[PDB]
Every structure is written in C-alpha cells, then in structure tokens.
Amino acid sequence: IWGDSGKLISTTA
C-alpha cells in the first residue's frame, strides 16, 4: 500500500 518515502532514506513514514 505505502511502498517507500521518496526524499533520502526510504523507511520514513
């Protein structure tokens, strides 16, 4: 459903 963040590290919910 979420996948990843998209900035630097992504695991940032």
Q: Is the dihedral of CA 6, 11, 12, 13 positive or negative?
A: positive
**Residue matched to tokens 């963040």:** 5
Q: Indicate the helix (H) or strand (E) that contains 7.
A: none
3: which DSSP letter?
Answer: -
CB 8 within 8 A of CB 2: no
Q: How far apart are CA 9 and CA 3, in angstroms?
A: 12
**Tokens describing residue 7:** 């900035």
**Tokens describing residue 10:** 């992504």
